[PDB]
A paper describes a structure:
[name] proteins are a unique class of coenzyme B12 or adenosylcobalamin (AdoCbl) binding photoreceptors involved in the regulation of the carotenoid biosynthetic genes in several bacteria. Upon illumination, the protein in solution dissociates into light-adapted monomers, concomitant with the release of the DNA and transcription initiation.
The role of His132 in light-driven structural rearrangement was studied by producing a TtCBD-[name] variant. Anomalous density confirmed the location of the Co atom in chain A. This structure is likely to represent the Co(I) cobalamin state, which is more stable in the TtCBD-[name] variant. Compared to the wild type, the superposition of the Ianaer-[name] structure with the corresponding DO2-[name] showed much less global structural perturbation in the overall protein backbone (average displacement Cɑ atoms – 0.4 Å).
Author numbering:
A (entry chain B): 82 to 277
B (entry chain A): 80 to 274
C (entry chain C): 78 to 274
D (entry chain D): 82 to 276
Write the structure that this text describes.
Amino acid sequence: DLGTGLLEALLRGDLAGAEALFRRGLRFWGPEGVLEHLLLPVLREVGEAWARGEIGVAEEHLASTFLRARLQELLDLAGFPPGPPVLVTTPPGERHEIGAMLAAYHLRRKGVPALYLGPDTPLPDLRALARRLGAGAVVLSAVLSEPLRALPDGALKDLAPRVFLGGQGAGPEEARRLGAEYMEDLKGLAEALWLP
Amino acid sequence: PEDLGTGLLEALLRGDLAGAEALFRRGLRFWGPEGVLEHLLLPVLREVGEAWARGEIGVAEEHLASTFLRARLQELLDLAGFPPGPPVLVTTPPGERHEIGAMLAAYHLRRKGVPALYLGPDTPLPDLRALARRLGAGAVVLSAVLSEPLRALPDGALKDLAPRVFLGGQGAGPEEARRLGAEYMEDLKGLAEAL
Amino acid sequence: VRPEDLGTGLLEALLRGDLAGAEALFRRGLRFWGPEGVLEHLLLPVLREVGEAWARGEIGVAEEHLASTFLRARLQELLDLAGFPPGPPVLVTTPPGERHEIGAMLAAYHLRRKGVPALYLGPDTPLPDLRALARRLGAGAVVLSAVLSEPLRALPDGALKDLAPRVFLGGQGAGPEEARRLGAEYMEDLKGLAEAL
Amino acid sequence: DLGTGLLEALLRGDLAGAEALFRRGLRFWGPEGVLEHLLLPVLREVGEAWARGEIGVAEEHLASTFLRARLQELLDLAGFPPGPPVLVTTPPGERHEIGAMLAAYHLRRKGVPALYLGPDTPLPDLRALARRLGAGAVVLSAVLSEPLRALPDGALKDLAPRVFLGGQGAGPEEARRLGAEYMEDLKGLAEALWL
Ligand code: B12
Ligand code: B12
Ligand code: B12
Ligand code: B12
């Protein structure tokens, strides 16, 4: 409901009003709630508005940068607990960061030390870092399907002892082909990781 | 203080984000906001860049460090004043994905009471002018790390994005700014003075 | 710790002398509510509980001093992150005899956040000295925060008139009538202050 | 003449310039050094200028508030170690804070958990806080002598097992009368406390 107001504030360059509206939502729904009720709907509307030609790239950039900033702040508010890290990123060629940041946030909320790398990490580099840090897991967020299609069979299999793949670009069959565990629900990710 | 840069980078490369945050706050408290960016954030960023280019670290390690430093700068940006009145749009040229210079410029402006709107990097020029016109922006500021994206632009391309257009970063120089129709500025402090 | 509990947590941290813990809780609040929000939803409620606990006799002045000093330091830190812009300043202080500084610092902070060069002088400034500084710096306004009403009672009618081209008075110690008596504009909401400029 | 420059910046309301000069001093002399070479000489010049009538109370206030803020930041950079605290304040009626903050800083630099309360604490309330926190010591800074003269004999005696009094307002006889240990040198404070 609040999404229209927030987007209108952003598109008129009223940063203070956007942040105030976002804080109101955060106070009302709480951290998880504001992400499902406000952040994600606005992100989606920005996407759709762009594709319809109602807004241009500058406006989309402004809105996306604002939402990233808000999500980064929630990520840091969940804080960084001890223990072997989980590396969170996106496949090579994937620049959509929000899904990855959400996954890191839901993990940290459950006491999992999710290290958000940013998007678009080469698989050998990722595997090397996981090995060196003794990471328990790698979590990948895929918005587009093409970057997954470009990977060879089994490519995600041994990035770390456990590898999870989600996002709208992914499905069970493609996860199976790549050797990743497929997950749709962020709230359950920590439990899936703690389980064998 | 002499050791904060080494300490911060080592903390990052071992995935000690809590340690890295504490060291960065120490730098912030010692040097102040502008100072920590000059004396800590930028030297560490540069070292990360050079280590990558020498092949000493991979992209995952660089990403870890870079993402953390971006987050810190964004946080300072949001703590600055955002005053009302005609904004200044801050971004990078099309094809330029290095964003930290643009964020720094937005930060220095906000610290001086200029309503700098950071768009993120890599904004098409027709879209930038549309938003500048629609918001009645007084200026556009572009940060260029690489020179190639500027060379790809036609003469006069930046000329009337807004009433004033500023170009800086290591990718830019006075001649290229003149060719593109932008004002060249080398020092971030001088940017705010120019307005 | 739920946001609803950060106030209790922060006060408990202070009352046991755990400054490191208090700072962590305050940063959590800052990240959750944002800069203005943490002041309204954490700093001010804690200060009020401290005040009420003192009046009930549960804590003394030393505990209040510890909490006030800590919260002042946090607000000062936010003030210095806002950046100080150029242009004719707004001088921010409290009336003579008024040693409560938080209201004044809050006013300076809200102004700086909106790009107004609010110069915080500290509290308790003699009126002739204040007027002299305003004219020398060409200050566009003076802002006074009054927590208690007694320091305003001590001032003669019209005392705040033309300290500067605009003079604003607020805080729990002030009301529109005392403001009218003293020759100041009354403002109740810190947000309205920036708009008035 | 960083000190001259800093004071001139403050008296003209150039807070950004004053902060930059202070950071320069901090970077050159370091934490202890900037206090000796910059903070204290400026405070004394402010004092002298006021007494000569060259500046008013508003200017003094502005400079004092700025220096307090800088010293609070150094206090927080020193950190707060664990263990039973030392409470640092000033006598009732004493509103001068810098001396007390300096004492807290020298203690924290030596790993002593010096809790700065702010100035002007009633003695019963101070004793109650020391008791409740199990404080090992109380440290008082006195600039003026009158606030000490107003106190009854033995008033400071058992605020904690160790009670130290210093500052220009204090001396050995008055410390003896009040039941405090008199100390002149900040550097020596933590050593006095350990022995
Ligand atoms: C927003 C959006 C954009 C915007 C804004 C997003 C941004 N700023 O990051 C921008 C303009 C950025 C964008 C870019 C593009 N996108 Co677009 N746009 C969308 C839109 C509307 C939403 C996508 C999104 O980011 N959602 C948020 C993400 C986080 O949600 P999600 O993946 O559904 O994940 C959910 C769950 O799976 C879970 N989750 C996410 N990750 C993970 C991981 C794990 C492990 C788990 C358990 C859960 C989980 O959390 C999420 C919320 O519950 C969709 C259409 C739609 N309505 O869905 C397209 C869509 C993704 N876009 C599309 C396209 C084509 C593009 C572009 C290539 C277009 C172009 N020519 O530039 C570009 C850029 C390519 C690139 N790499 O740069 C297509 C892709 C089609 C395909 N077959 O792959 C889509 C699907 C449109 C459509 N319905 O046809 N897009
Ligand atoms: C530091 C650095 C980084 C930092 C960059 C931070 C950033 N710029 O966003 C990090 C580690 C993030 C990085 C990442 C990458 N970069 Co890099 N790295 C470098 C390095 C060492 C260049 C220095 C630099 O970026 N300076 C930082 C900026 C902020 O400083 P500056 O531009 O001098 O600007 C200063 C002033 O001009 C002023 N300023 C800036 N903008 C403006 C604007 C105005 C108006 C004004 C007044 C002032 C002003 O403020 C700044 C501080 O003083 C070079 C190698 C070299 N030159 O020695 C590469 C280099 C630029 N990187 C390169 C690449 C390819 C990358 C990566 C793709 C590598 C990777 N996969 O890990 C990524 C891309 C990430 C991204 N898309 O953002 C290549 C580019 C090759 C090419 N010709 O295309 C280089 C040349 C390295 C190499 N030899 O291969 N990089
Ligand atoms: C901290 C404190 C002290 C500290 C102050 C430290 C410091 N340097 O800041 C010290 C030790 C000095 C102190 C001493 C005294 N104080 Co006292 N203490 C407090 C306390 C806990 C502080 C309140 C505060 O700092 N901020 C809260 C203020 C800013 O909020 P506010 O006034 O509601 O104002 C709001 C708006 O009006 C607006 N605003 C503020 N200024 C301005 C300006 C403008 C222009 C605008 C638009 C808006 C605006 O912003 C605020 C947020 O919405 C309060 C308890 C309380 N409930 O406040 C008492 C309280 C004010 N103190 C009280 C008393 C009695 C005293 C003493 C007289 C008693 C004594 N001898 O100990 C002395 C007198 C000292 C003096 N002459 O100033 C009482 C007052 C009794 C009463 N209600 O009338 C209170 C209420 C405590 C209680 N009884 O519960 N105190
Ligand atoms: C700043 C200042 C104020 C500020 C204080 C603000 C603040 N929050 O800090 C304000 C505006 C409040 C102020 C007001 C007043 N003050 Co005044 N002002 C000064 C000033 C300029 C400070 C200078 C100073 O001494 N700083 C340094 C501190 C640290 O003291 P110091 O001399 O350096 O002592 C050193 C050591 O003693 C050591 N130290 C300190 N504490 C301790 C503790 C221990 C254990 C140890 C080992 C060492 C130690 O550290 C210091 C640095 O090395 C002085 C001018 C001056 N000559 O210094 C006056 C001065 C002290 N003020 C003075 C007076 C009288 C007043 C007022 C009475 C004026 C009035 N008309 O109201 C009021 C009284 C307020 C009160 N009730 O206490 C007189 C002192 C009179 C006297 N000889 O007794 C002075 C000297 C003015 C002058 N130039 O004549 N003042």
